[PDB]
């Protein structure tokens, strides 16, 4: 397929620097313009930078001009955003995106990569079970989950049974505690009859701190 894969985003220091790469595939990169668009969490889209197919021209947003540098290596099929003098307002998911016609329309986008500009420390999460019980049952359905507490920075991915369980799942948005660390919950609603027959294991991955917890969640009465 036509494709765009971001990498290299993650935790970085204020006044620091970071490099963003975009592994293009599925078409010939040499052919069209390219773009970086950022989205600060819970906020709107903001165009950062654009670059022609040769490398010819590069244009930048005002707020990033003189700090950020866009570049493309056609030979290995990759797009770059060199980020210098990182400020707090640069914290954002940065999207790799391909242009189309003379429309200036972006017709395909990568799935983004989080950049966090913070002095705060990395910290892996603790995964506690959210045990099902009768206080967790209401008419053949039983709810259960995992509490992914005290972690920094974003994100954590949570799966259930390696990926085998997707139905009834509700992995919540994270909330920043007063302690400066994030916390989230993933819950699932299953049949109550399966409680002593079927295993339930939440799979938590917090890459920025390199943590990989599998927690078994067992019934309470």
């Amino acid at each position: 397929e036509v494709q765009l894969l971001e990498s290299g985003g993650g935790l970085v220091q204020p006044g620091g620097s970071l490099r963003l790469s975009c592994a293009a595939s599925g078409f010939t990169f040499s052919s069209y313009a390219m773009s970086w668009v950022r989205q600060a969490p819970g906020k709107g889209l903001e165009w950062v930078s654009a670059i022609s197919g040769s490398g010819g021209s590069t244009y930048y947003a005002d707020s990033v001009k003189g700090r950020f540098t866009i570049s493309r290596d056609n030979s290995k099929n990759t797009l770059y955003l060199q980020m210098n003098s990182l400020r707090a307002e640069d914290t954002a998911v940065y999207y790799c995106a391909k242009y189309d016609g003379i429309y200036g329309e972006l017709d395909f986008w990568g799935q983004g990569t989080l950049v966090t500009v913070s002095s705060a420390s990395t910290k892996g999460p603790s995964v506690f079970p959210l045990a099902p019980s009768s206080k967790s049952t209401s008419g053949g359905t039983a709810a259960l989950g995992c509490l992914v507490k005290d972690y920094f920075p974003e994100p954590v991915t949570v799966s259930w049974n390696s990926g085998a369980l997707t139905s009834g799942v509700h992995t919540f948005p994270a909330v920043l505690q007063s302690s400066g660390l994030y916390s989230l919950s993933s819950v699932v609603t299953v049949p109550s009859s399966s409680l002593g027959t079927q295993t339930y294991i939440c799979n938590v991955n917090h890459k920025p701190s390199n943590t990989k917890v599998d927690k078994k969640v067992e019934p309470k009465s």
Partner: protein
């Protein structure tokens, strides 16, 4: 720099309804305008390029209109999966500005939450803290009130909420409230209630447990 304004900034409509989102550029920008849909936790997706033309594979119920300083995205008949935030972008004169976005959420029939409570885990209790979670599952509308009680005493300041985005199939929401207090304080009390107010509930519903069972 041309300031793109979208209106409305948020909107509620039912399935099959006609939706009209307005994007206004503060100077003529010919037919250089583009429509993007952003579903949650996912990348934007081009809908209307050239202010009126449709990207391939994009449902024909989406339509673009306008030139000069006034543009419209129209969805002819809304559907569950159309839940998203919609952005216009002028591609005419650099810097390439974006509209501030329009949040489209689906109106559906009232659903009351299924409420569940979870005491803190033995594992956490060791570590020194106690997190009690209350879960409100699959309800419409989004507006809901969760009150924590500790031995019938109303709690304030010691809790945090999180709402899932609207479910693209059945248009419902889920909420989790997390009461966090110290093992010291947690062990000073017996009854831990979660009292939930909602439209789809005749009267507030309480879920509780006694520390020790």
């Amino acid at each position: 720099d041309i300031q793109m304004t979208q209106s409305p900034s948020s909107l509620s409509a039912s399935v099959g309804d006609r939706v009209t989102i307005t994007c206004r550029a503060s100077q003529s920008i010919s037919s250089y305008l583009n429509w993007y849909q952003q579903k949650p936790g996912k990348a934007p997706k081009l809908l209307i390029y050239a202010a009126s033309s449709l990207q391939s594979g994009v449902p024909s119920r989406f339509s673009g209109s306008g030139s000069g300083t006034d543009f419209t995205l129209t969805i002819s008949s809304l559907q569950p999966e159309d839940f998203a935030t919609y952005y216009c972008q002028q591609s005419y004169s650099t810097p390439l500005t974006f509209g501030q976005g329009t949040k489209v959420e689906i109106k559906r029939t009232v659903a009351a939450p299924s409420v569940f409570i979870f005491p803190p885990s033995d594992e956490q209790l060791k570590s020194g803290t106690a997190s009690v979670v209350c879960l409100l599952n699959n309800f419409y509308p989004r507006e809901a009130k969760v009150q924590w009680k500790v031995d019938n005493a109303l709690q304030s300041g010691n809790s945090q909420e999180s709402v899932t985005e609207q479910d693209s199939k059945d248009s419902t929401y889920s909420l989790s409230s997390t009461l966090t207090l110290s093992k010291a304080d947690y062990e000073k009390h017996k009854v831990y209630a979660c009292e939930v107010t909602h439209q789809g509930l005749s009267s507030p519903v309480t879920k509780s447990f006694n520390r020790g069972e």
